[PDB]
Amino acid sequence: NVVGVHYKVGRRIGEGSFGVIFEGTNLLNNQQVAIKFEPRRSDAPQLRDEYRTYKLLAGCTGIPNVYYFGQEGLHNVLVIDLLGPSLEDLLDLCGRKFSVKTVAMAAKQMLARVQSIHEKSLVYRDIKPDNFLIGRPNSKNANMIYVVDFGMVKFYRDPVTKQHIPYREKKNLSGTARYMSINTHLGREQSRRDDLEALGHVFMYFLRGSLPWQGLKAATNKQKYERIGEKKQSTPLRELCAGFPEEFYKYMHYARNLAFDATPDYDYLQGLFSKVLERLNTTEDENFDWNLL
Amino acid sequence: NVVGVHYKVGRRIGEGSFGVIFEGTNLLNNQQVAIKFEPRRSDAPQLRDEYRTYKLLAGCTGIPNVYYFGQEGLHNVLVIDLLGPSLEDLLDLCGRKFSVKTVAMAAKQMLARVQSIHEKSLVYRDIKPDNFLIGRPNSKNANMIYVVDFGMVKFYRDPVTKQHIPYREKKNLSGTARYMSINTHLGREQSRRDDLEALGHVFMYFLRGSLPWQGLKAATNKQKYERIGEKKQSTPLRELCAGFPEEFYKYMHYARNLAFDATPDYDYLQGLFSKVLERLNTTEDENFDWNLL
């Protein structure tokens, strides 16, 4: 089957609520690509917004290249660069947890991608390990960590005036409950800080193999986000982080205390993760757990 | 890191009790391979037996090529051809179940691999969807189904005299409980028939998305194989297969009734799956569910 005139569709490599994702090949140059298919339906988030965001971030490190957007029958198709598995996929290969070294090194790369997004005036809003994918097996950037999936980014400040959006409440909960900021749970408008806090939740998940609020109780969908949020507030940071380098507690702490429109101090956050590597007497190399025996 | 003199180790692509599996490249010709690493320990099944079996089946359709076996430090390494994902991996991509068409077409290929093994005088004994993998994405046999993992095959008849091994009992349960023959549960010695029956259990699993005896009760490891076995005996075939083409019931039935040393009638079994395709007014093409939208 051939879409976008010169793109051949292979087999499924991903399937989510937002559609199916196939591996494919560009018939002109034979480059490998991923073809996202979204069914055209009332409630489904436009795939065109994602294409626009990819174009906006084009040229940014760790953001894949986009190649085509169009409609094919009852589907919208977005063609991106083919990438490797996600950090969640690799967890299943490493015992369901990562070592401090891998977390600190990944953190530095994951933190640089989120900052890049913020500098383009967007807030990600869907921070999760399933969205950070690494390079293709035999290529230059096989150990580079990429961010994908921009279906729910939003402008947090007018792009040209740098005017920050106002603080609103009564918002409806969006992304994955497991990693969201406490604020998102209280229905408050999400900002830079919230991305930074959701990333810190992802970091502790990497470290412990699980979070205190996973698999809660027998209740309805809205009750799950409620109880999880309460648990997140009852679990103190020193306990959540007990047993790992102080730098992780310092990160969770900074992230949770940022004021709504405050510009995060990315260099401080990055230095934290550097101190972690120093203390282990190692450098930032490409010796991630999934490359080790 | 480099093993076997000229093989470079990449990243993990699999991890089981039997060790880790890395993707790699042969430095001489740049062919892609999978490098299995087994830790050298008392209770661990020799990896050399697997290499011998691969060499025995070399040249057989759907059996990967083996390239090297040796010891590297505290590990034994087996280097095989790099393959695609397993039929269990692809289930997660297709809604956790396959259509009659995909099951009948896969069945025909899975059945030919098991027969090939039997004709080399071996019985597989570890039939499961995790062991049937398809080809690499961009290659000639991307839709060919392969069998891998020969750690528990056994000779069921002296290879030269065709003398069939005797019927023994009091055997200790081996493979995955979910798919094993009822006989395996009763501690009887496994033969051709048992492979055929475990494959039929895999076929119904593909079809229904699950089996009646999955996730049983709160008890010890030996009780799990016991209760599951009882359930397997209490679930009548017409019920297990209710709702799908008769050919599936006919298959489960033939397989369960074979006598211990009886030679299966493979052409009958293969014809069954052909009738299934005829009735759907389709041929045996490469339109598996994971290639469809």
Ligand SMILES: NCCNS(=O)(=O)c1ccc(Cl)c2ccncc12
């Ligand atoms: N599930 C493991 C990694 N692959 S995936 O198909 O889910 C996937 C989802 C979303 C996007 Cl944008 C991708 C881009 C490239 N490769 C896989 C992509």
Ligand SMILES: NCCNS(=O)(=O)c1ccc(Cl)c2ccncc12
């Ligand atoms: N888990 C999905 C498919 N790949 S795998 O690494 O587990 C795997 C396990 C065992 C063998 Cl022999 C392989 C051979 C080739 N490719 C993957 C192989």
